[PDB]
Amino acid sequence: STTVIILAAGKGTRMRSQLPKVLQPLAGRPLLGHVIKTAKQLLAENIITIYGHGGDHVKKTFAQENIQWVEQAGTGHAVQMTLPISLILYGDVPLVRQTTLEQLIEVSNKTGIGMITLHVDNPTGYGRIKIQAIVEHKDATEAQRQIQEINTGIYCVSNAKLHEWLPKLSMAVADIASIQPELAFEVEGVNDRLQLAALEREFQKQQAKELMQQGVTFADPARFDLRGTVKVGHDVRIDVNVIIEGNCELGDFVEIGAGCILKNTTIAAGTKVQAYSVFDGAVVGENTQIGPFARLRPGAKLANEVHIGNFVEVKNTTIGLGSKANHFTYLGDAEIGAESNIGAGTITCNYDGANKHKTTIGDAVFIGSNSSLVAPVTIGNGATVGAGSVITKDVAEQSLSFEQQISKANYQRPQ
Amino acid sequence: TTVIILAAGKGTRMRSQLPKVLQPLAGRPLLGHVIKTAKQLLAENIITIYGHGGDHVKKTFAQENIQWVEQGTGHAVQMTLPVLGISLILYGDVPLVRQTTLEQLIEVSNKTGIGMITLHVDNPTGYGRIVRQDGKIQAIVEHKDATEAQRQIQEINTGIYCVSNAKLHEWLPYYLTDIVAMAVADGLEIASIQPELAFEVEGVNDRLQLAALEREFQKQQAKELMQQGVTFADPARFDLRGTVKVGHDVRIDVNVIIEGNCELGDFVEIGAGCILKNTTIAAGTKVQAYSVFDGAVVGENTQIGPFARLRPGAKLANEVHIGNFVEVKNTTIGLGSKANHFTYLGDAEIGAESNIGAGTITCNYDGANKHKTTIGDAVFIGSNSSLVAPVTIGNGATVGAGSVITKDVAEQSLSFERAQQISKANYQRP
Amino acid sequence: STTVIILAAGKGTRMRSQLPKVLQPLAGRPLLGHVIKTAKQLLAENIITIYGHGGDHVKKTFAQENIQWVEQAEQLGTGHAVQMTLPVLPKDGISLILYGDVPLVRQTTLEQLIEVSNKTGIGMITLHVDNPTGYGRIVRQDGKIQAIVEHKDATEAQRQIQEINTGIYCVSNAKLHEWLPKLSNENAQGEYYLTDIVAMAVADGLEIASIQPELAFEVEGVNDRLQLAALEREFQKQQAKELMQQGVTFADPARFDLRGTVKVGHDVRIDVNVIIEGNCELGDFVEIGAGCILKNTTIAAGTKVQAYSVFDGAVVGENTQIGPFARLRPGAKLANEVHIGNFVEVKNTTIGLGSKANHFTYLGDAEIGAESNIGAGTITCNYDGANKHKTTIGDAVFIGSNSSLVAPVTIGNGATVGAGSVITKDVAEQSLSFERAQQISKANYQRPQ
């Protein structure tokens, strides 16, 4: 049974933030959230978090998590509170990989104590590392400062043996395994916004590299952001300044245009998304054409072959096979069938000021331009709606439903 | 204090029709950066030496009380003699020199009567060499005229001097670096300082150097904001073209541009690709991606975007929600009101707790004049309504979808369009 | 007579693609397309392409190109690939040997290679690299090329050679017809090495000419997406640099993409994250705002394009004001002084001098005159479900807001259309057409709770 200890008490005053250090964002998630995620991935029997200043916010943020919280009112003094195997992690060192921490556990269980070390080209200011001791640069004599192997602070000690060493802090070899991380930023902490941004860029760069190793094409991998997870097929092409948030999926041959933003969205094979389209909680079928300037909101579901054009907003609406809304329109709380056409300026009036109501549009329907569909209304298959109509009664299958222009000659416009 | 700016260079490598000092850097001409800095220093007089294209330059800075002079670099300052306390000698094409550096130079120069800014560079090729015997500056030798031993000097001349107006009149009556030896000849000891940042004293000659100086400036500006506590998703994808005041816990996503004078309150979140110009945004507001603001005033805990367009006079109270493909121009929107869908609100006054449906349009323009639309509190404007200004929609009123409003709608009243549903059965489309 | 031979058979396994390697994209064009374009610039009499796996796609992609296709069913070396060209290889003249996955080689470089190889009968392109690890080494005896030794086989002394092989040769076809059948695979890999023709040429008493490219990425190949992205960035960086040398201003030249050609005037200003596709033109003093994307569009002098405007097949005159969030589609033609505002879509529409559409609108299949105004919410209803129809708007027409113009319809000069109108009949010159008021008022209405 492996338990993880997380130090998350730092105020991080260099952040100049009102929130505790470990709630600062990195790729769309608080620092501490990254570490809790890895600790849950390790199948940790227990997770104990040391909070400090502002711990109310932290406990509030992770309330639905089975964590044993501990107040801290030094790093050695901080761990001492946990006495009332184990990993020692830092809330502000967020990117340590589960494969590294397991690698540390296997070598520590055979010895009873392990740690992560790292070789740095420039070790100025860091603590210097059979391992014999660690001398911090502040108190380290000039001779030891030439060491380029530095300390990371990440330890793994047996639960039994920790209790013997922990109170006597006024040591381990007297009664030490080590590994180095696969990537240096795994063990990198942050103290201010400069360091937060530099780690963000290291993380994004590595994420783009891993996607390219999977076969993704990037117009510019330095202008890409993943804040979560994405599942990708083959021949996926991603243009500049795309952002991907939450958990997304991109099918085979999916092409994502410049500046598109996807959150909690799946896009099936063959779809081409033109530039500046944003998705949140959308499900997009195969061989669709979207954008530019399309906005899909939660509940937007597009069947295969659907076309969505510019300045289009789809919210909580399913659009059946091959239907098109090429021009500016608002489709909300709507069910639209197959092979239907939504004219420019069409609006679902889905909100009466208090409640939402459903619009139902059949197959092979033509909704003429500048139409207002007052929900709840059903428009049967094959029907046609005249341009500029306000529609309140259900339109029969195959029916044309439409809602007197006056002319004055030789009219002079105001001067 | 008077500032003398050398702004005669043609800058032919720019391959531009405008003189060099009108090329852009962070949203303002090169010379404008220097004039701005000269005004920060409280210069009694500002004298600018112009050359090719001086008509454009004088026209561009017409509302600035500067004494213009027509046109070697030493010969250039000599032409200013009819027009000159102390004076600073700056270059119009070296725009990013800071006022704190120029003040630092004045403190050491006032003690001697002549000081200068120098710089250490790894490669000093082509620059003038600062020759110091026992720590005191003796002369400046231009790279062309420098002995082989002297070419090893890595402290170079920047061309930025602070000289007494009295001593200048004796020295000026060809290269300006000869004023150094002239100074040691009269017994004065050339003071020196170095800038805190090398790009402060950097000139530009073509578009390559212009872009690299721009990127140096932007990197430094994002760094200073990060030191204040701003968060950047990517500090290399950020542009400041003016000034911005920030609160704590401000978060700025990628490719944000900030122009003019802006303000960002506490906990403000600016999404990807937003562009803000002369706009204030108060605490708690979240701006979604691709929203652009010009002359906007935004309250607390508002929700804006994505794809919002706010234009001058747009004023949003606290709790307002503005959604996608929305254009607000010269319009005030009261507390907690919503316009979540595509709409044009122009020249309008909107009350509190009101709802603007998709497709609503203020018809504010009759082809010649603009007219005001006035919307009260707790008004519901149904979708695709055309509001023909001037018109008032009183509190608690409701407007039916697809309505054209030309008469004032009474408080608590419903106005809706008589819409007869006409059906033709079994209709075949063409 | 000059012939170009393109080796385009690689599967490109590290691309993890379903497509052959040479159809992967670079600056908006498949790799092989860049080389076919340069080969046509050289005025090549013949173009012979060696395909392998997936040649059906390749043949389909360049079907409207006069290419002689040659299959390489088994992959047994580049020399074995060139051997395949013998049934269709000419007897006189010279041939260039290029790679489909080495796309950015410039025509000026290949001309220099042709000029020095005409003097000897065989030349090749070489390159000096700081680290030559993994490359084939150019072996010179008394300064004359004798062989290429692959990194696998090079002794420690030979690995110090920093002159590497690019694989790009210019050879007389007669000597190729003599050398290609006598190629030997009696080595370790069992492959027919193309470099053996260097050994055969020196054996015949020929001197091997050589040149170096002006830019190293000209001769760089790609095997995976990392290399693809790194070459793309190298190409874009170089493209922005050349535009700046011409006088273009960039807010950030590292946030710029040219995927085609662009002709530019003086004092052109290009903001961040602009993309340029196909063939474009920007006149003097044109300003392109942040994030704009232009494809096959010309923009004349003085026009100011605000941010997030997208153009495809547009023709834009002088001193127009466009965007932000403008969308121009093929056939969009704007006269001088036109203003296009936000959330505006123009498709196959001509707009005359000084006319304005400042607010959200769809103008499709329309002809619009001069000094006319399009109100917010205006729509040309151009599509009846089967055919498209034209909307005609005259000079100094005022189209009030939320108007639906049902094509085909004409709105005459000086006419005025009331807000919220549906127009189906032609509107006369100087005439007003408006919708009869139909607002019903009910006092003290309580909305649902």
The answer to whether B317 is a known ligand-binding residue is no
Closest CA to C393 of C421, C373, C418: C373
Same-domain pairing of C140 and C231: no
Give chain A positions within 8 Å (CB) of C310.
274-276, 292
Instruction: Compute the Cα dihedral for C368, C304, C309, A334 and give only its sign.
Output: negative
C-beta separation of B356 from B381 below 8 A: yes
Task: Indicate if C2 and C150 belong to the same structural domain.
Answer: yes
Cβ neighbours of residue B212 closer than 8 Å, sequence gap 6 or more? none
Give me the resolution in angstroms, 1 decimal.
2.5
Catalytic residues of C: 359
Total residues belonging to chain A: 415
Tell me how far apart the alpha carbons of residues A228 and C260 are, in angstroms, rounded to a whole number: 34
Structure tokens at C248: 């273009």
Is C152 exposed, middle or buried, given 0-12, 13-18 or 19+ CB atoms closer than 10 A?
A: exposed
Identity of residue C259: R
Could you tell me which residues of A are annotated as the binding site for acetyl-CoA? 344, 350-351, 369, 387
Q: Is B224 helix (H, G, I), strand (E, B) or coil?
A: helix
Q: Write out chain B residues lying below 8 Å of C401, CB-based.
A: 344, 361, 363, 386
DSSP category for residue A25: B
Which residue of C lies nearest to A341 if distances are taken between CA atoms? C385
Alpha-carbon Rg for chain A in angstroms: 29
Residues C238 and C188 in one domain: no
Number of domains in chain C: 2
Alpha carbons C31 and C48: distance in angstroms, whole number: 16
DSSP per position, A174-208: T--EEE--SSGGGG----SHHHHHHHHHHHHHHHH
C241 three-state secondary structure: helix
B367 with C291: Cβ contact below 8 A: no
Spatial separation of the C-alpha atoms in residues B248 and B225, rounded to whole Å: 11
Statement to judge: residues B24 and B85 lie in one domain: yes
Is the separation of the CB atoms in B359 and C402 below 8 Å? yes
Q: C-alpha A264: how far from its chain's center?
A: 8
Interface test with A, best of C29, C226, C277, C379 (most A CBs within 10 A): C379
Q: How far apart are CA C288 and CA A367, in angstroms?
A: 37
How many residues belong to chain B?
430
Q: Phi then psi for C232, rounded to 5 degrees?
A: -55, -45
For helices A98-109 and A31-41, what crossing angle results, to 10°? Answer: 50
- CA of C331 vs chain A CAs: smallest distance (Å): 17
CATH of residue B350: 2.160.10.10
Maximum Cα interatomic distance, chain A, rounded to a whole number of Å: 106
- Map A222-268 to HEC letters: CCEEEEEEEEECCCCEECCCEEEEEEEEECCCCEECCCCEEECCEEC
Q: Which of B177, B205, B233 is the last residue of a domain?
A: B205
For residues C323 and C308, give the distance between their C-alpha atoms in angstroms, rounded to a whole number: 7
Distance, CA of B361 to CA of A370 (rounded, Å): 13
- Same structural domain, A259 and A215: yes
Total residues belonging to chain C = 449
Among A212, A327, A409, beta carbon nearest to C225: A212
Angle between helices B207-228 and A193-214 (to 10 degrees): 120
Please give the backbone phi and psi of residue C341, each rounded to the nearest 5 degrees, phi first: -95, -150
Nearest CB to A368; choose among C18, C362, C381: C381
Neighbours of A93 (CB within 10 A): 24
Size of interface B-C (CB pairs under 8 A): 159
Same-domain status, B272 and B397: yes
DSSP assigned state of C14: G
Residues of B with a catalytic annotation lie at: 341
Q: Residue B8 annotated as binding?
A: yes
Q: Which tokens go with B376?
A: 């009260």
Q: How far apart, in whole angstroms, are the C-alpha atoms of residue A113 and residue B166?
A: 76
Which residues constitute the domain of residue C234?
224-449
Same domain, C296 and C363: yes
Same domain for C359 and C260: yes
A36 to chain B, closest Cα gap in Å: 22
Counting one residue from chain A and one from chain B, the pairs whose CB atoms sit within 8 A come to 159
Residue B273 CB neighbour total at 10 angstroms: 30
Amino acid of residue B369: N
Last residue of a domain, one of C191, C223, C255: C223
Cα(C396)–Cα(C411) distance, rounded to whole angstroms?
10
What CA–CA distance (Å, rounded) separates C329 from C309? 11
Interface test with C, best of A205, A406, A412 (most C CBs within 10 A): A406
Torsion of CA B68, B73, B75, B78, to 10 degrees: 50
The set of chains that have 3 or more CB pairs under 8 A with B is A, C
What CATH number is given to the structural domain containing C61?
3.90.550.10
A390 to B417: CB separation less than 8 angstroms, yes or no: yes
Largest CA distance in chain B: 106
User: What's the token pair of residue B179?
Assistant: 């004023």
For residue B74, give how far its alpha carbon lies from the nearest alpha carbon of chain A (Å): 43
Picking from C25, C345, C434, the nearest residue to A237 by CB comes out as C25
Active-site entry in A53, A137, A307, A327: A327
Q: Which residues of A are annotated as a binding site for Mg(2+)?
A: 92, 191
The verdict on C386 and C297 lying in the same domain is yes
**Do residues A343 and A369 lie in contact, with contact meaning Cβ atoms separated by under 8 Å?**
yes
Helices within C180-312 (DSSP H only): 196-203, 225-246
**With contacts defined as CB-CB under 8 Å, which chain A residues touch B248?**
16-18
Does residue A187 sit in the same domain as residue A199? no
CB-nearest to A374 from B236, B341, B401 is B401
Q: Is C203 exposed, middle or buried (0-12, 13-18, 19+ CB in 10 A)?
A: exposed
Query: Last residue of some domain: C166, C196, C223?
Result: C223
Tell whether B324 and B344 lie within a shared domain: yes
Which SS3 state, helix, strand or coil, does residue B251 take? strand
A217 and A363 belong to one structural domain: yes
